Amino acid sequence: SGFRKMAFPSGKVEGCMVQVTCGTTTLNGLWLDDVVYCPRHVICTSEDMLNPNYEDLLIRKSNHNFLVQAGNVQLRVIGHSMQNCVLKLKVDTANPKTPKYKFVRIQPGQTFSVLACYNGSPSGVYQCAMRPNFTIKGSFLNGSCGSVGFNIDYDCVSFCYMHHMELPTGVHAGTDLEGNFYGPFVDRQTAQAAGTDTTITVNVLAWLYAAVINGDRWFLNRFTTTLNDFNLVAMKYNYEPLTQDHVDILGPLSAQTGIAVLDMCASLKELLQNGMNGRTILGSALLEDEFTPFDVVRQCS
Amino acid sequence: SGFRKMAFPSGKVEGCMVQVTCGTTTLNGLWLDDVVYCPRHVICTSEDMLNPNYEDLLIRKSNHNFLVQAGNVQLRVIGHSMQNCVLKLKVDTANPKTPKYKFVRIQPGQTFSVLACYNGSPSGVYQCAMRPNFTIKGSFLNGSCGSVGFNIDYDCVSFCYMHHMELPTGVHAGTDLEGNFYGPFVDRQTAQAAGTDTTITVNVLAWLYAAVINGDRWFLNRFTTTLNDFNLVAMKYNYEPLTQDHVDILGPLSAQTGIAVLDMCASLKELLQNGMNGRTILGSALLEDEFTPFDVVRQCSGVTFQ
Numbered sequence: 258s259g260f261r262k263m264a265f266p267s268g269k270v271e272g273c274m275v276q277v278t279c280g281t282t283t284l285n286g287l288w289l290d291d292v293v294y295c296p297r298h299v300i301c302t303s304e305d306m307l308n309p310n311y312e313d314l315l316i317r318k319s320n321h322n323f324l325v326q327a328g329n330v331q332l333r334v335i336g337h338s339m340q341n342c343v344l345k346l347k348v349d350t351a352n353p354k355t356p357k358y359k360f361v362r363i364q365p366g367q368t369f370s371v372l373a374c375y376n377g378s379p380s381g382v383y384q385c386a387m388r389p390n391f392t393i394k395g396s397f398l399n400g401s402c403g404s405v406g407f408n409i410d411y412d413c414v415s416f417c418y419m420h421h422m423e424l425p426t427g428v429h430a431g432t433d434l435e436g437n438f439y440g441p442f443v444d445r446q447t448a449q450a451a452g453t454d455t456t457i458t459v460n461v462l463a464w465l466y467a468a469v470i471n472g473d474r475w476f477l478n479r480f481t482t483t484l485n486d487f488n489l490v491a492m493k494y495n496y497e498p499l500t501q502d503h504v505d506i507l508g509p510l511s512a513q514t515g516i517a518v519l520d521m522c523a524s525l526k527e528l529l530q531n532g533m534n535g536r537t538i539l540g541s542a543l544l545e546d547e548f549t550p551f552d553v554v555r556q557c558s
Numbered sequence: 559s560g561f562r563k564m565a566f567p568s569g570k571v572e573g574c575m576v577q578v579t580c581g582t583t584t585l586n587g588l589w590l591d592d593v594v595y596c597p598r599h600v601i602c603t604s605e606d607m608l609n610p611n612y613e614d615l616l617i618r619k620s621n622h623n624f625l626v627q628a629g630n631v632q633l634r635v636i637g638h639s640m641q642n643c644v645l646k647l648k649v650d651t652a653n654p655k656t657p658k659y660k661f662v663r664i665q666p667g668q669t670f671s672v673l674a675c676y677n678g679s680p681s682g683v684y685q686c687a688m689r690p691n692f693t694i695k696g697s698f699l700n701g702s703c704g705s706v707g708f709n710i711d712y713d714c715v716s717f718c719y720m721h722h723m724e725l726p727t728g729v730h731a732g733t734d735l736e737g738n739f740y741g742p743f744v745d746r747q748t749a750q751a752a753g754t755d756t757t758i759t760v761n762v763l764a765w766l767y768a769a770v771i772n773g774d775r776w777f778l779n780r781f782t783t784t785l786n787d788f789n790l791v792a793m794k795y796n797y798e799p800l801t802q803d804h805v806d807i808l809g810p811l812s813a814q815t816g817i818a819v820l821d822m823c824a825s826l827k828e829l830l831q832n833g834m835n836g837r838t839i840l841g842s843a844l845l846e847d848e849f850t851p852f853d854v855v856r857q858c859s860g861v862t863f864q
């Protein structure tokens with residue numbers, strides 16, 4: 258028993274992290290087979306980060322303008338190409354620690370582990386969620402770009418996030434490993450702001466089921482609700498709508514605990530109305546929304 | 559910016575995890591050089607656990623009674639010995655992935671990362687604190703015993719915890735890697751309970767500094783207090799005493815933010831006496847105590863491991 262914000266073991270990703278320098282900018286790269294992936298903004302200079310023309314800037318680069326270091330070893334760059342907002346540096350050596358991997362683009366509400374790195378070296382690992390407004394609430398300092406987010410269900414690493422920038426509210430934006438930003442953001446210094454965020458309702462429900470599995474009952478009640486009445490209430494608290502997909506995915510947890518999904522929704526309605534009255538749920542005095550249904554089943558079962 | 563509950567990168571430890579089977583019990587072992595470490599209760603039947611006589615049960619065992627597997631490679635056990643509550647299985651092969659490491663015993667209030675494993679396979683990593691009552695608030699299922707806790711300094715892994723048991727309130731107990739339990743617990747099937755716990759005051763202060771660094775300042779006030787006066791308040795709220803050494807350890811964060819420790823203590827006093835008034839600090843509505851001062855400095859300055 259117990260329930261913790263649990264990340265995937267990071268070793269398979271640690272063996273892929275390298276340092277990339279272009280000009281005066283250093284950040285991290287992801288070295289898989291004979292390709293190093295990194296944010297293309299490594300090639301911007303201080304005289305034009307507002308409207309960089311990345312195609313024009315990259316054609317002017319020689320392979321030797323990129324300094325790639327794997328621990329104590331310089332890797333020789335032999336070609337370069339750009340895919341959306343990611344730079345792909347072909348190097349003369351395949352990474353012998355390349356794991357089984359795939360690239361996956363995730364949806365809002367999905368969670369993943371982040372291996373925060375500086376100068377090609379890992380600093381720490383933590384869990385994140387893709388927020389409804391397509392930001393993540395990370396912990397990232399200068400030099401962290403190119404750090405990645407990933408899952409490792411079974412034995413294959415699914416890379417889903419590469420870090421690029423920090424927005425004015427202190428939250429973070431980045432791309433999938435095909436270089437497409439999550440959300441409307443762009444790798445330019447033009448004014449940009451995250452939309453108003455909302456709470457990931459399906460995940461809150463998953464976490465309430467985790468609390469029941471771990472022995473909590475105090476927030477249960479004798480009421481149920483229709484799906485549409487639930488959404489009408491939940492949206493008044495800036496919660497995301499709960500879809501029939503979400504109801505369906507919570508089925509297994511509802512079967513395991515004997516609490517129907519719409520019965521648990523009535524519990525959530527009451528918690529939003531009343532608060533916790535000095536109590537806690539799984540060690541939190543707030544409703545937690547960065548555990549998915551899949552996360553709850555993985556950690557509890 | 560940002561501030562997360564952050565674990566150490568687990569790669570150096572993942573390469574040490576193996577599966578150990580004795581009889582019908584399977585759990586995890588820690589393979590370092592040519593020794594595998596695991597909980598000694600692996601040798602017990604449900605019978606023996608009632609009142610185990612560990613040294614008598616162990617002499618009865620032979621090397622072949624222990625099946626050790628690194629991935630799908632069997633490691634031959636060539637000797638065995640007990641050290642306190644940990645079993646040491648000598649194997650015929652040194653682990654080629656052995657990192658630089660040492661065994662350390664931590665103090666209550668100190669944090670560490672847990673690599674939760676099942677069947678010798680790493681499954682997840684999370685950050686814990688050794689509670690003042692010598693339990694940890696872990697997340698552990700059947701088969702998790704032998705999972706370890708650790709810290710990293712530069713390139714050296716310091717192993718500090720091996721998991722043995724779950725107590726009735728759902729918290730967890732285990733040993734250091736020399737087999738000494740943390741807390742007044744025994745690896746015997748007898749009634750045992752976590753004692754009343756307390757809050758790790760120096761860690762709450764460190765997390766308030768982390769909040770200030772990250773722009774969260776509503777709880778700051780013009781007042782200061784004395785160590786004496788604040789500790790009378792701490793006692794009242796089941797907070798651990800704040801010592802002068804704690805104050806000194808927080809000095810760097812005081813210099814960085816302009817908030818002296820006793821100035822921050824006056825903030826904490828008001829939070830304890832008045833609550834949060836509906837507000838939050840670093841995304842929490844409770845006062846968080848599982849970040850040490852060193853954790854805050856490391857995370858906020860980007861320290862890495864080699």
Ligand SMILES: *[C@H](O)[C@H](C[C@@H]1CCNC1=O)NC(=O)[C@@H]1C[C@H](C)CN1C(=O)[C@@H](NC(=O)OC(C)(C)C)C(C)C
Nearest residue numbers: 306397398399400401402421422423445446447449559
């Ligand atoms: C890459 O290592 C770096 C990571 C940042 C630094 C601080 N925390 C992080 O997560 N990313 C950047 O420096 C990118 C490059 C881009 C040209 C600017 N940038 C930013 O993160 C900056 N944000 C920014 O300009 O935001 C808008 C004005 C576009 C909203 C910040 C350094 C301010």
Ligand SMILES: *[C@H](O)[C@H](C[C@@H]1CCNC1=O)NC(=O)[C@@H]1C[C@H](C)CN1C(=O)[C@@H](NC(=O)OC(C)(C)C)C(C)C
Nearest residue numbers: 258607698699700701702703722723724747748749750
């Ligand atoms: C080892 O994998 C296992 C880990 C446990 C299982 C459930 N969660 C965990 O953290 N450890 C045990 O099963 C040990 C072995 C011992 C013979 C019993 N035991 C327990 O953890 C049990 N606790 C227990 O008996 O507590 C007292 C009554 C002794 C206080 C629990 C399985 C109940």
Ligand SMILES: [Cl-]
Nearest residue numbers: 780781782783
């Ligand atoms: Cl005063």
Ligand SMILES: [Cl-]
Nearest residue numbers: 542543843844
């Ligand atoms: Cl909280």
Ligand code: NA
Nearest residue numbers: 361362433435
């Ligand atoms: Na894609």
Ligand code: NA
Nearest residue numbers: 478480520523
């Ligand atoms: Na109900």
Ligand code: NA
Nearest residue numbers: 779781821824
């Ligand atoms: Na003050």
